[PDB]
Amino acid sequence: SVPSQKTYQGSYGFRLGFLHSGTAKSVTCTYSPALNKMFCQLAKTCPVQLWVDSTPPPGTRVRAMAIYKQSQHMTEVVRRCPHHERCSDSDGLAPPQHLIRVEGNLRVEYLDDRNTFRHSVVVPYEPPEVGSDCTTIHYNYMCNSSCMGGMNRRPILTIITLEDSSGNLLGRNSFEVHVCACPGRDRRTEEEN
Ligand SMILES: [Zn+2]
Numbered sequence: 001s002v003p004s005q006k007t008y009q010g011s012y013g014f015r016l017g018f019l020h021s022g023t024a025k026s027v028t029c030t031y032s033p034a035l036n037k038m039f040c041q042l043a044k045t046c047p048v049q050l051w052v053d054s055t056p057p058p059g060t061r062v063r064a065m066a067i068y069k070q071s072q073h074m075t076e077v078v079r080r081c082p083h084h085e086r087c088s089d090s091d092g093l094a095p096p097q098h099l100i101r102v103e104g105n106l107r108v109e110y111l112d113d114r115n116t117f118r119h120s121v122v123v124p125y126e127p128p129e130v131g132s133d134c135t136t137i138h139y140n141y142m143c144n145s146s147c148m149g150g151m152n153r154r155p156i157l158t159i160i161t162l163e164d165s166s167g168n169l170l171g172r173n174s175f176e177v178h179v180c181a182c183p184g185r186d187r188r189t190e191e192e193n
Contacts, residue, residue, distance in 0.1 A: 002074045003067060003118065005159050005174050013053025014162050014171030017134050023184035030183050034191055037176040038158075039183035042144050043089070045103065048160065049134040050125070059165035060125035064139060065118060066099050069155040069176065077118050080143045081150030089142065095119070099151075100158070101140040125162065141179045151179075 009015060018031035018038065028044035031037070040046045050062065066078040079085070079097050086096070094101045095110055098119045102108045109122045121139075128135050139158075143150050155176060162171040180186050 003065060003116075003159060004172065005067065005157060006172065007174065008169075008172045009053075010162065010169075010171035011054070012056050012162065012170060013051075014173065015051040016160060016173045016175060017049030017051050018175075019047050019049075023187050025182070025184055027184045030187050031175075032187050032191055035176065035187075037178065037187075037190070039178050039180060039187045039190075040141060041181065041183060042179055043140050043142060046139040046141065048137050048139055050137070050160075050162075051134045055127055056125050056162065056164075056170060058124075060170070061122050061163050061165070062125050062137060063120050063122040063161045063163060064100050064102075064137075065120040065159045065161075066156050066177075067118075067159060068151075069157055073154055077116075078156055079119065079150065081147040083149070084143050084147065094121070094142075099141055099143050101142060103138045103140050105137075141177065143179060144181070145179045 021027050021030045023030055029040040029046045068074050068076055078099055080099055090096045100121050102121050102123050105123050107124050111120045145151050146153055157174050158177050159174045163169055
């Protein structure tokens with residue numbers, strides 16, 4: 001079946017957070033609290049915060065996966081468009097077909113699920129850095145929502161899951177994401193509508 005997208009804070013009080021970045025033209029990633037929706041530019045840094053009430057032990061892993069929002073497209077694997085999946089922009093770790101990457105982490109791990117064929121990217125959980133009360137992961141989305149032959153304007157969710165070293169589910173959250181050229185503009189537009 002389709003991966004679960006049901007929210008669960010779980011034992012560690014797992015919640016997601018996002019920078020309050022506003023909607024100026026220069027912004028490459030902006031989150032709409034009202035919409036629970038991230039607007040971001042292709043290949044740009046996309047900070048996602050992990051907030052916990054208790055610290056998960058080292059060995060804990062954080063996985064990200066994209067799925068289609070509409071029920072008629074839920075069974076279809078979210079993947080990059082032919083153009084981008086053949087454009088050689090791979091960092092030498094990410095499979096060229098994967099929509100979601102993590103930048104700035106040499107311990108990043110990618111998975112093609114042997115049964116479901118779905119793509120996901122995982123990193124080790126690290127506790128909050130100095131000066132912050134949350135843990136931040138920098139994601140990159142390697143296709144535009146507009147990309148023909150890929151998402152083709154079909155809305156998607158990103159599902160973030162907290163799992164232990166043995167693969168046991170600890171927590172889950174999710175947010176919608178729209179990859180576009182003018183994220184600030186799109187956020188304002190969708191919030192007025
Ligand atoms: Zn594309």
